[PDB]
Amino acid sequence: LKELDSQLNEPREYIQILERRRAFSRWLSCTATPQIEEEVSLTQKNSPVEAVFSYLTGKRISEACSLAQQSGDHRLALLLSQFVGSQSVRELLTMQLVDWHQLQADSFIQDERLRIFALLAGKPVWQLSEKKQINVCSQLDWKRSLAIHLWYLLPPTASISRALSMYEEAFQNTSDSDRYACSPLPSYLEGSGCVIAEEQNSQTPLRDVCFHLLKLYSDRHYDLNQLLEPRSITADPLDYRLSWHLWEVLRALNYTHLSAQCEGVLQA
Amino acid sequence: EEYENICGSQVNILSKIVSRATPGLQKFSKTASMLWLLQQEMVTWRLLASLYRDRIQSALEEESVFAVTAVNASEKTVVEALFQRDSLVRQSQLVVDWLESIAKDEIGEFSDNIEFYAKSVYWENTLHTLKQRQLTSYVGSVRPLVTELDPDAPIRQKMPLDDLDREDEVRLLKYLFTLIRAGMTEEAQRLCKRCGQAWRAATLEGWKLYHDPNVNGGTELEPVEGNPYRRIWKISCWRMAEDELFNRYERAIYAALSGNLKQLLPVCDTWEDTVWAYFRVMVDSLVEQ
């Protein structure tokens, strides 16, 4: 209604893909701000390094730089102030981390500060000379976990669908890597402590409606049944309020691969 | 341009005589005066060949340039317009390019002849001294030093390095300033990259004007340039210029990229350096305006 709609010509698919990423690169901050603002309210007076990291996990680089000039961490503030474009700084920190590890100098730097340097260097996990690992996505929710993939682990020139697939590559079992991201779950199951113990009937593991919509945007033939099911939206298997109003928008957007039994069950 | 090649050829010949004179042989006084006279002549032909070209091109284009500014312009594209719009800014930069070319020609081949004491790590002797103090066999004197090894530790603790790294940091900071004083800011970055200062290799980029070409709709995912916090970065570089705990050359390095003439003039120790300090900040200030 706003950016693309300024163009008095048919807006190219490339501009659409970019404004879709620019808008989602707001949404992944708006889904993160209130938890960052509580986390900072608690951490600021005990550890400014965790408060600076929390701001960076919501893209609040201006506030992270401001807090680093307020804490007495001025060459951290300078380093952060430049990180909004130049890939050279991501590669210079990639070398600096390789050198501190090989020289066994890493083990005289804060793990919390090495976590910031790993985030900036575009490293989701770092392996220290102690054999400690620093997972940059550790303790985080599923939205800030996906936001790290969209902002720090990729270029400005990648798609939403590559950030979403690199995030799905981060929370599943492989033969060759440990898991480092959390799983996408509905907001009523977040914080619960539920390690879903691989349910021996439920061959489809439950996820958030927001994740299913990001899959349908990444793949036009992705499932609609698990997307419209109320369990993806609410803690109630009887609340079809959003389910029907999502389908009667997807039907208007020319998605047509739902079953007539599934439309019948939704409408009834 | 051929007058500069004739004078530059004779500067080359006279340099290739003066470099072969035994020091104190008073006959070579005229050879050195003739070298400097024709070196100042050579760069005065260089100055003429730029400024009178601009002043004749402008006086042939000024009937035509009914330009319009775009509402969605970036810092880069405001300055791409300024250097068309403004013959005072354009001629002021041609004086910066001129004075940086003089300092470049005095540097020549020499960049890779620089021996430091450190040769496998940044602050290697202070790092060795800390790793030696961590050993329970340390029956040495406890000289006060930094206990941390991030690049702020000397000014966060207000503690020194040991005197080998504290020579190399002072050597390096003059060479970095001398390269930026010659427009060789990418060689100053490569010298930071070569001397293990991967952090100061990055600080020497933060002045770049912001641009995203994809704001107007290109055709492929074209790259984003510069620093969208360049203003906050200049405020931060001005803060690095005014604490007396920074080296005169590190203060001058950040000043020459943030408009701080007042902390730059404390290092400009020729006529050319002093003209350069005014013109370099005059362009940077008019660009900010």
Curated annotation (Swiss-Prot), chain A:
Residues bearing the modification Phosphoserine: 47
Protein name: Nuclear pore complex protein Nup96
Gene: NUP98
Region of the whole protein represented: 1283 to 1550 of 1817
Curated annotation (Swiss-Prot), chain B:
Tissue distribution of the protein: Ubiquitously expressed in fetal and adult tissues.
Places the protein is found: Nucleus membrane; Nucleus, Nuclear pore complex; Chromosome, Centromere, Kinetochore
Superkingdom of this protein's organism: Eukaryota
Stated family: Belongs to the nucleoporin Nup84/Nup107 family.
Function noted in UniProt: Plays a role in the nuclear pore complex (NPC) assembly and/or maintenance. Required for the assembly of peripheral proteins into the NPC. May anchor NUP62 to the NPC. Involved in nephrogenesis.
Associated disorder: Nephrotic syndrome 11: A form of nephrotic syndrome, a renal disease clinically characterized by severe proteinuria, resulting in complications such as hypoalbuminemia, hyperlipidemia and edema. Kidney biopsies show non-specific histologic changes such as focal segmental glomerulosclerosis and diffuse mesangial proliferation. Some affected individuals have an inherited steroid-resistant form and progress to end-stage renal failure. NPHS11 is an autosomal recessive, steroid-resistant and progressive form with onset in the first decade of life.
Assembly information from the UniProt record: Part of the nuclear pore complex (NPC). Forms part of the Nup160 subcomplex in the nuclear pore which is composed of NUP160, NUP133, NUP107 and Nup96; this complex plays a role in RNA export and in tethering Nup98 and NUP153 to the nucleus. Does not interact with TPR. Interacts with ZNF106.
The protein's name in its UniProt record: Nuclear pore complex protein Nup107
Organism: Homo sapiens
Gene symbol of the encoding locus: NUP107
Entire protein: shown range: 175 to 463 of 925
